[PDB]
Structure 1
Amino acid sequence: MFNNSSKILFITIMIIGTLITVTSNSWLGAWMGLEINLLSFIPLLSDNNNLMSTEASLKYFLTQVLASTVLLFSSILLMLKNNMNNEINESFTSMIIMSALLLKSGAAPFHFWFPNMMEGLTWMNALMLMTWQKIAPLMLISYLNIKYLLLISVILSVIIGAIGGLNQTSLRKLMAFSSINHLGWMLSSLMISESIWLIYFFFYSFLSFVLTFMFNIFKLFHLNQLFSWFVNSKILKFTLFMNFLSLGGLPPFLGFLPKWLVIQQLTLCNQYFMLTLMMMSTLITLFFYLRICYSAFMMNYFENNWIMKMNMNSINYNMYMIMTFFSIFGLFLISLFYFMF
């Protein structure tokens, strides 16, 4: 990834381990794929010149090792009682499998490691943590037909990930609490349609992957670093900050589309109350999105005087502005898509 080819090797074994996990027709192959993914993701997220990155790596290690051992325990119990790879009728060992998967995914009430560890990271490893490391536990939740435990996780995730993100002014913990709130929308789609979950995950990872690039290039680790961020035209900062209204679900931006397809598929499947509970949740998420959006919508700011030129990478800022165009004017591609039929 950065500064070493061995990090590219670690990304390769990361992709290999996650794709080994999600393709497994047995829980043991999924478990060993999670072991490969954990092995790959410990060395990225470790840096000896940072005192808090090693603590974040330790928190990730302890949380994933506890969650992987409970997952193997209840998998072995499921094989002990109902000798095939699945269960005919739902029982408590399926709930233990789902709880051990929810500790890996970071959903509430097992969410507490996730923003407490994200303070120790950079932005690229944060993006790998809250997008790709949610492929393997969320795709394994799809094999379990449990409604009450998943519904409790959905309600707790959308309540906590909205409320909890109000207090932090640091962008990493705020974006982690935003990822907890968007995890509840993914888990709410997981028991109605796996394709609609894949679409919400792809567009959420797209909006995460374009909002990381604005913070990775300019090194914006705090809320007032946005207010002190220098741009050569204030209309450019006004346009670049529209991706938070996209991630808040405001039409006519691109991020209204995955929330909208989740709402359409939930109402077709006759769920209305938890959908209404997720309406009140995303207003608070849009509220703490707007405190970032204070830094560009007032058009003139009392700014620091010493900095005069802004600097960026070539290929990273070139790839950033392709997706910022599609995160604003992405609803003109509504006719091109054919997944949703």
Structure 2
Amino acid sequence: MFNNSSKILFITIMIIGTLITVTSNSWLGAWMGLEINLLSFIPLLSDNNNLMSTEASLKYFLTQVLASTVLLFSSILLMLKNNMNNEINESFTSMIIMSALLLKSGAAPFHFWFPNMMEGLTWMNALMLMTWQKIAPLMLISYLNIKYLLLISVILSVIIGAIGGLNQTSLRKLMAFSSINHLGWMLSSLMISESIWLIYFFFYSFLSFVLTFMFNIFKLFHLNQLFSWFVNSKILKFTLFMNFLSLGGLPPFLGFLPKWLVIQQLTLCNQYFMLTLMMMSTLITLFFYLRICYSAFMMNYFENNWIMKMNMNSINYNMYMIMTFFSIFGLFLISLFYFMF
């Protein structure tokens, strides 16, 4: 719900379409829901006001459409040669279905479209692609059970997902790379278990949701803008920016709670090597986040002169920094969460 009333409509149709997928009984039904998602999302992404939006639209459509094409196609084969939706075993019939889904959600080797997207997308449009356009393909990846492909995805889901993030100066591309890394954790987590995967995505949704929702608020689009963005005290400049470290999930930031949950269950599966690699790369993720937080940790920097006052929406700001406060002191709610047992 950004400018027009039609935003509500397409969001609604999108929700129904994706909800069909997660509740879909057979591959065909899931494919049906996916395409409905494809419809509902293109108009929001393809704003008619500017240019960059429109180019992102062809790339999104021209990619997702092929993804759906291959997905249904590989479905027929699996559900021919096995004559049954739940094949007895994972063969060449099934890896193609993942390769479809991995591209649709933008996983490791199939990601290049995803950074190019961010240039076009505005903030909440990006946000909405970040969070919700990754549920359905992932929940389907749950049904597919090929260990090694997910493992190669998890291996490569952080390497590029962090090395690129080091390089980007446009906040749009950084969020892309930040999520591809985080997407590495979901994929591993879903290889292990689903209840923990459900939790981890939710906290990721929450965290990414608050993050970009302030970037929308202040319209900070470039590292220079972050250094230049006026704040009266240059203290809330720093209090608000703890969340950039909640990205890395360092204990006193509530991003630790999901990463701890995934780590605990994953090592219980004994894939210790995989943990080491993802967790090695996590530092590189947190590395450029400090590169972001040079703007706020120290105080009283050199600033532009013309600005005298800084202003923002009531609704967005009122919602935003409630979510932030939780990102600050979230852990002590250790009791409040009972879904881990």
Q: Provide the TM-score with structure 1 as the length reference.
A: 0.99
In structure 2, distance between residues paired with 1:278 and 1:141: 19
**In the aligned structure 2, how far is the partner of 1:202 from the partner of 1:151?**
22
Hey, what does 1:20 align to over in structure 2?
A: 20
Deviation at 1:229, TM superposition (A): 0.4
How far does residue 47 in structure 1 lie from its aligned partner after superposition? Answer: 2.0
Please identify, of 42-51 and 203-212, the stretch whose mean Cα deviation from structure 2 is larger.
42-51
Listed one character per residue, the Cα deviations across residues 293-340 of structure 1 (whole Å, up to 9, x for unaligned) are 011011111000101111110111000011000011000111111000
Give the secondary-structure state (helix, strand or coil) at the position aligned to 2:295: helix
Q: Give the deviation of 1:2 after TM superposition.
A: 1.6
Provide the C-alpha distance between the structure 2 equivalents of 1:50 and 1:4, rounded to a whole number of angstroms: 15
Aligned CA RMSD, in angstroms, stands at 0.7
Deviation at 1:60, TM superposition (A): 0.5
C-alpha deviation, 1:12, in angstroms: 0.4
| Runs of 4+ more than 2 Å apart | none
Q: CA deviation at 1:109?
A: 0.3
% identity of equivalent residues: 100
Deviations 1:203-248 (A, max 9, x none): 0010101101210010011111000001111111110000011011
Deviation per CA, 1:189-213: give whole Å up to 9, x if none: 0111101111110000101011012
Residues in 2 aligned to 1:256 and 1:138: alpha-carbon distance in whole angstroms? 22
Question: Which structure shows the higher helix fraction?
Answer: 2
TM-superposed CA distance for 1:86, in Å, is: 1.6
Q: CA deviation at 1:14?
A: 0.9
Deviation string, structure 1 residues 105-146 (Cα, Å, up to 9, x no partner): 100100110011111110001111010000010000001111
SS at match of 2:308: coil
State the Cα distance separating 1:49 from its structure 2 match.
Answer: 2.8
Distance 1:38 1:311 in 2: 36
Distance 2:48 2:23 in 1: 35
CA distance in 2, matches of 1:120, 1:4: 19
Structure 2 match to 1:81:
81
Offset at 1:48? Answer: 2.6
Question: Gaps spanning 5+ residues in structure 1: where?
Answer: none
Q: Distance in 2 between matches of 1:47 and 1:190?
A: 34
SS, match of residue 339 in structure 1: coil
Instruction: Find the aligned partners of 1:86 and 1:309 in 2 and give their Cα distance.
Output: 61
Query: Which residue number in structure 2 is paired with residue 204 of structure 1?
Result: 204
Question: Any gaps of 5 or more consecutive residues in structure 2?
Answer: none
Residues in 1 aligned to 2:157 and 2:337: alpha-carbon distance in whole angstroms: 30
Q: 1:121 to 1:167 in 2, by over 3 A?
A: same
2-structure distance, mates of 1:83, 1:239: 58
Q: Distance in 2 between matches of 1:87 and 1:300?
A: 63
The equivalent residue for 1:99 is 99
Alignment map for 1:235-314 (pairs within 5 Å): 235-314=235-314
Cα 1:4/1:49, change in 2 over 3 Å: closer
Q: Match of 2:120, SS? A: coil
Matched, 1:2 2:6: no
What SS does the corresponding residue of 1:75 show, helix, strand or coil? helix
Q: Distance in 2 between matches of 1:241 and 1:317?
A: 14
**Mapped partners of 1:107, 1:61: distance in 2:** 17
CA distance in structure 2 between the partners assigned to 1:318 and 1:34 by the alignment: 34
Mapped to 2, the partners of 1:318 and 1:56 lie a distance apart of: 31
